[PDB]
Ligand binder design. Sequence first.
Ligand SMILES: *Cc1c(COP(=O)(O)O)cnc(C)c1O
Ligand SMILES: *Cc1c(COP(=O)(O)O)cnc(C)c1O
Lengths: 466, 466, 456, 456
Amino acid sequence: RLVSPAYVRQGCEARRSHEHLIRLLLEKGKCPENGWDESTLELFLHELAIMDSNNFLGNCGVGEREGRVASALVARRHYRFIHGIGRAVQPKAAGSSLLNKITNSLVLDIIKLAGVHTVANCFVVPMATGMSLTLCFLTLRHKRPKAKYIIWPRIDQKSCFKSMITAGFEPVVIENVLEGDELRTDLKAVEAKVQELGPDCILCIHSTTSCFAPRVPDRLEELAVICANYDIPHIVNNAYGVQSSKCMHLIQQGARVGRIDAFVQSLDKNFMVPVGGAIIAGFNDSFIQEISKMYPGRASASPSLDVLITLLSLGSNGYKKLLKERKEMFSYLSNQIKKLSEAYNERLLHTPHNPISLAMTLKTLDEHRDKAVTQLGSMLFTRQVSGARVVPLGSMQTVSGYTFRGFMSHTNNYPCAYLNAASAIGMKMQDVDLFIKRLDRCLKAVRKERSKDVDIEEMALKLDNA
Amino acid sequence: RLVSPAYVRQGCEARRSHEHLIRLLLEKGKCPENGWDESTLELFLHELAIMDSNNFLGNCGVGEREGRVASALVARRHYRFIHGIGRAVQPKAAGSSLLNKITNSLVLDIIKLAGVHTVANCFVVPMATGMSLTLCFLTLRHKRPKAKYIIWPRIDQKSCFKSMITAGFEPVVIENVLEGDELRTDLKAVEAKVQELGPDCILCIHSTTSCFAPRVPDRLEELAVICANYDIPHIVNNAYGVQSSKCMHLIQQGARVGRIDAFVQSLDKNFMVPVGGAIIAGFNDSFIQEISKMYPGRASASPSLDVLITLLSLGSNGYKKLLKERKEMFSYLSNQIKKLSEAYNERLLHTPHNPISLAMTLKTLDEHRDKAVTQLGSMLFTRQVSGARVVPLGSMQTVSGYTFRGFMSHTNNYPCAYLNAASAIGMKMQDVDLFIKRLDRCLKAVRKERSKDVDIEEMALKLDNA
Amino acid sequence: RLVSPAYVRQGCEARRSHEHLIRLLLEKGKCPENGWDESTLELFLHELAIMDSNNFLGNCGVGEREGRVASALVARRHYRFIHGIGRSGDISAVQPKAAGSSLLNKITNSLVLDIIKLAGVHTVANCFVVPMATGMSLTLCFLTLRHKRPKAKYIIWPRIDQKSCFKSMITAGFEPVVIENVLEGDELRTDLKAVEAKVQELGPDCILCIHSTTSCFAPRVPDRLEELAVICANYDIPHIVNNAYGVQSSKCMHLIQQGARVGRIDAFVQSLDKNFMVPVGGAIIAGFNDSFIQEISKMYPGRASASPSLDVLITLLSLGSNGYKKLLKERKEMFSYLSNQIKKLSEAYNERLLHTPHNPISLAMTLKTLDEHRDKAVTQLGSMLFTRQVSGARVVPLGSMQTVSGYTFRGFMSHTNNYPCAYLNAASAIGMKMQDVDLFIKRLDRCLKAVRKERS
Amino acid sequence: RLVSPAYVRQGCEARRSHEHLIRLLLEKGKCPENGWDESTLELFLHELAIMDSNNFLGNCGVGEREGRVASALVARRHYRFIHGIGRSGDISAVQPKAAGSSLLNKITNSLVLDIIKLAGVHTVANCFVVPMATGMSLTLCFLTLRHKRPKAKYIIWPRIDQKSCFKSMITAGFEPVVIENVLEGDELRTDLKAVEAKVQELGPDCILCIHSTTSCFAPRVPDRLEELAVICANYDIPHIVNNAYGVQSSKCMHLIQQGARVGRIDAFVQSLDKNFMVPVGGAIIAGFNDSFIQEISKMYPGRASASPSLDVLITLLSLGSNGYKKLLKERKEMFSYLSNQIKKLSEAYNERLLHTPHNPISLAMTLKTLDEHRDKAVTQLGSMLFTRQVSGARVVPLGSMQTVSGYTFRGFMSHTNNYPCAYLNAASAIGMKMQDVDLFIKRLDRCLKAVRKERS
RNA sequence: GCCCGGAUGAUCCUCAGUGGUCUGGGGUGCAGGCAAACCUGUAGCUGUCUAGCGACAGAGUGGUUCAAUUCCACCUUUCGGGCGC
RNA sequence: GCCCGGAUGAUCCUCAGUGGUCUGGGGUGCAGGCAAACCUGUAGCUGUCUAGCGACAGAGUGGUUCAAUUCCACCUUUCGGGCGC
Ligand SMILES: *Cc1c(COP(=O)(O)O)cnc(C)c1O
Ligand SMILES: *Cc1c(COP(=O)(O)O)cnc(C)c1O
């Protein structure tokens, strides 16, 4: 095996083309335009992992947190990143620390590409959006120690509602105003509540962009002006709004004319990675760092690793293509539901200000007698349609002591029951066509039961009977 | 490929021996005594993953959280568990939900095996110990709304200290009492502070078991009696105490004679998995469930998956063997440091009540002139010794506004500077021998510089010069 | 935990849809039309591997071949298939020690037979994967024929300049009889009269077989299999076809099918890697006489690697027959695009595309305007394309001499002693993308510019 | 990000310790004494694979063998080594299209040569891995000898009842001359006078080689290689040694070394899976004449699979020479334990351990007290052990007849026509654990109890 | 290896009985009463903590019941019966 | 493919100049003044939002500087020079 020096030359020159892509990533911190090949990616990950002390060849550990791993399956599935992330001259996990920095720089680049070009700082946190919102509220407590209220335009979603209560504050629920079919921000009620309670007693205004139709993204510009005038922090729930240029442009415009202290988005919903992580972003770099420093102890590196792999494999061109296809799939889904609803004397709710979610009416379904609105949601489930959300009339729900009327509808008395469908990133035409086909069959069976492909149906009938 | 019915028979009978181990796990929820083979484990994981809707063959998704995965590397490294964990007749992630239940049952079994036999309930949370302690304090706020103080016997560790402040409470630092070389709980000062502030103003007493020598685990029994008498919650930081039968028995005895509302432990420190997760356990089942319900939104399944793989691969016998070896390695490390310290006129601090961590004095090192105590920590680092913690005299440190004197030493004026080493799970004899060998060389070079194996040293001298 | 009857039910319902696909594969042995999801595939492979005795839970081994694996990396990368395929006396016999590997082998051979029919040879009777490449697989065919024709010494072989298929005859222990090709236009084609003359000179009983070739580099074209098959049928001489990468060509496959219809074809051999985009190491031996194909299989001594069979099994189940058909359709489309791009580029440099309509895979462009005795440009062009990361382009100079196993070829790489000119080869093989052609055209354009500049 | 000069420095310092191990391997080609960590190994493999042209970033392919991979599962499980080993005319020649695979092949063969010396044949001159099992590898040896001895028709072969090594001679196209063994005590040993008599009867020029066997089932023992090597040297006859699983036996290896010292051994062949705990599919051909071993390698037509070479490379780098030595030492210890346990069990059932001290791997226990014409207990015992998940135990009955490739064996599996009794085989092969023997003893004890109960 | 029928686990040993705090038939050791005999009393193991003495707990895992050595399911061991490339 | 030397990116087109808000030498279109001519003025692209008009932003990515078309590093493109299983 005595190798020729040309072999060592060829072996060195072969690695240079890969190192060049790695050096460009490290120098400018931007997503590659075209995605890396898997070989470049895994070479990069292996070279980062060996920088952590637990992967040193001559390492000995006499501490209680040495990154020892009992299972080889566990070590390999994490690419030997064991020490997690957190934060100088004696780094125990220099590779994980570099992984954290690059990942945050890549996500910041995507956030600018997605529409918030003036974002100043962001970081990945391995908690989902709800806990990440809680961490924002926990940071604001020390800044506004006399504050106990969070003003919150109503959106029926348990995680973002619980985030305020888990943080130890009292939500002030601002009901929405019905304009046509849409539920929109009641700016008059928001400002009246600010004056009633007093700006010093308000921890922040907690607004939401991405949401289920017929709710639309909040009027962020007007809310940001209210927050700037009364010196009240503004925290935006942007859980799955990164994928929507409409939502991102609302955030940029809100920060331009007024105040947005932070906006939070889910990793899984915007980057097609496992549930578990989120991004906290903002326009004041010092404040965003303050939220980061509020986190006690080290944290999992697994969500950062997931989105690092994803963005390097997709590239900015790959992510742009997903954003374009999401818009095209939204138009296709909208046209298909419009065509289907006509056959059953239903209609697509008129919600032009919601760019992600759509709703079809269910007025022809008798829920009081036949409970067909509830039956529809079950039948769609047994036919393996996921994400189709059915909203009946008059649902009463208690969440952490607060009682919601008309729950899931974001208002006390919406005119009708309806069904939700959304065009989120990664959806294919097959998703739309199968959903339309199965929804058609479910509506037929509901109507047929009042007058008096195959294997999904055979198991559906058995589950429906059980 | 027309197969014989005997082939289908053989193929069915072959899987039965594996399914038998799986059924026993699901029926009784106990760790297997002997570890599963990898084939049984991966068959089990694959059968769980296909129960999640994102892995259904005929699934169509029209929602915003469908578990879509852009990168095949990401999907495979998580065994196709994408939906995370959280919490009925329409489960979107029935496989992940079963994974969560089994993992919590396995961890509960290990906690009983480790020494807390009367534990009633526990759950894995994908946050490290600091954030998990915060979640405990956040849960207690609603129970004791007039409380603002957390009484806390001092331990110099930034994560557990920050946990109280991030939760929005004011730590009341109780200084420790020096008994011989050991720093122990000042029970008189704890109770005097309870009476001074008033029990209703105390959110909880926050005690600690696992800690660096010369601090020892807190007097949990006496603290639990104080908590029971004054009706004050008791939260125990047991970050890496699961591996110590001494620590676990303190927790069981504390709950027997008094009150322990919850104890928290790190996943990585006690189970040799990546940093990122923790276990919250307790003796009141309803209260432990209350902490669980306080968490907003879904959470990462990756820490649960790691410890599930680990415990199924190790078995209870494998974990018991690691616990036994940790005790043997503690005696060996203690005897080796005792022998080395004699050669340099130092000594092993007398800390018999700390079963994990040890400390060797550094009295012969001149830190005021030569800064040799600080130099020692650097030299050990450059020689690739990790976890060796050097504690100089007179370190002043501010953490979230609070100023610590004598930081890292858990007291304002400890008699001497010292060096920490620990026998944690997974440590091998090689770790001890290499640490002893390199510490010997570092002490020689420090003393030699006052009078006036090879490649680790060559790089160490270069880093030491830089 | 508390596995309610719901979890037991849901776990069975979830496995049903995957097992439906598996059962359809086992009952009919056909390639799935649409490819399987990875989850179905890895579930299938895991359930196959657990059938092998080395993966049994309560197993104890007291033998010398227990399938023990020292490295976990080795075991996992092979999906725990350790025992190989076959038994000591037959690579097709079922191994009770390795029932899962035996099932893997049977399914794989059935999928491959299905593809061969889909690819164009609908009358194929039997085939099997062998974990040797095409040259060594041709040798196995010749080794099988020896006992049937004990007086045979020669193999009649229309010339094709490829060392492996030439050495296959010599390694088998026979003497190649090289039949020179006929220049018909720009194409090199079978000299049928010279083939029949050698049959009459040497004697049919002295000839082990006629060894013809379909897939080849332009300007050579597939052999005239129909006329060769008639010669073989008339003289009772076996006919072995080297079809190394002809599975991807419906024209090559139809030519094999037609030769078997009008005359005699005893076996045809094809490469796994060239036709199924898997690593090098395996081949397929196929034929129309079921018993004779089984004879070749039984000639193989001992067990053999399962790795090539596992690769094609994974590939075909993931692609599906629709996926493979799509790759075949795209190969034709890329052939037309590559040909048009070469024609366009050849105009700009006063060259031309050689007219080889009977070769559906390989193309040839003249290099007559390049001087090699003056500049050595023809020889340099090959290494210039290589340094610019163009792979697969053959530069064929004039008058190259090459000795292979004692036999001297004149005009090597050109399949004849004096082809009129030097030329460049490019091919449209399965898996090729439009970017492959565009980069090749751009980089070849830069190579020719540099040679002209270096002369001027 | 902000890769400070610290991160660039730390990244280079971290890679240094791993590259030190790699450079030590490349400069000397020796097995590391202590095994590599997985991180070092996978870093090495990844840097090798990126040297292959199919893994280049700016590559375009216009050929028919570009190493395209349709399935990502296939590409990853092979660490992106797609091109196989060798070239069209030589499996040892460097492939400029696959420089990484060529380097993998050279390193692997060097590691294997190092182990062969460590295992006991210190005078070995050359060896190479071939991705065929032992039987097919023996065939390649015989195929190489044909051109050197064109009049040769026969292979003289001391009988061993194993179908692969017997078929290897026939597949190569030669006639086996079966030499019956001599009963010496309980052992079956080489009949040297019958071997020399066949040499004189048939004529040395008519004999292709003498084909001897080391590793074998008791009561057969390794052949008398020293006396056979002298016979071959005196008559100028090649000597090919079947050493299928003898690498793990220092006594087998020393016997090969001594035969080469006093006489002639042209090549010895061993299985990869039986000696290195890797999947079935590869073998090692080794010898003492460097040029002749290279001749066998050059006889192989075409490229070949890299998968067996990758498996042994991973295994040997992970084990280290210390790891392999430890497995060899444990095999001897397990042999003594298995033998003592069999002796103890054989006492309880009025049986005995056959005295076969010259076989260091395989053991044989009598089954004379079992009646087969009355109860068919001997035949049933085999399937009884199988149903209790005992693998590798050979039950050898009396008077079994078996036809292999037209040749009829009498007393098959027993290596002689009339061995005095039926017996049971068990072996201590590398990787065996104490649990293997204890489970075997317990389950065999239960089988014998059931047979006696069924009779009574 | 699996299916099926039993027994089996951890209160000195055994053998019976018993849903009610266990029982009594033989023994063994220790200890006393009056050398077999014989009467009366007594009894072991594991983990953790502790310098110790001792202290906290365990009776295969769970279930039912006010109450389980007793009844139920599973597991461990073992005895049966059956299946035998 | 790589190393090296330049130029190059996104204000009508070009060609020069310029660290100072750009310049002027030729042209083109549009628009007026007095058919070549000729004078004066004017100018494009992308993303997002919007029924629209329009509105918010972008000049390759960053750096230096009070200030960058100008200077620096890298990237894109391209022209050179060199390297050729
Ligand atoms: C293993 C073995 C062989 C070779 O068998 P293959 O399946 O070809 O590898 C030959 N002879 C003996 C004695 C063997 O044990
Ligand atoms: C591929 C090929 C062969 C076989 O080459 P191997 O390396 O043995 O697979 C034979 N003839 C031709 C024309 C080929 O293209």
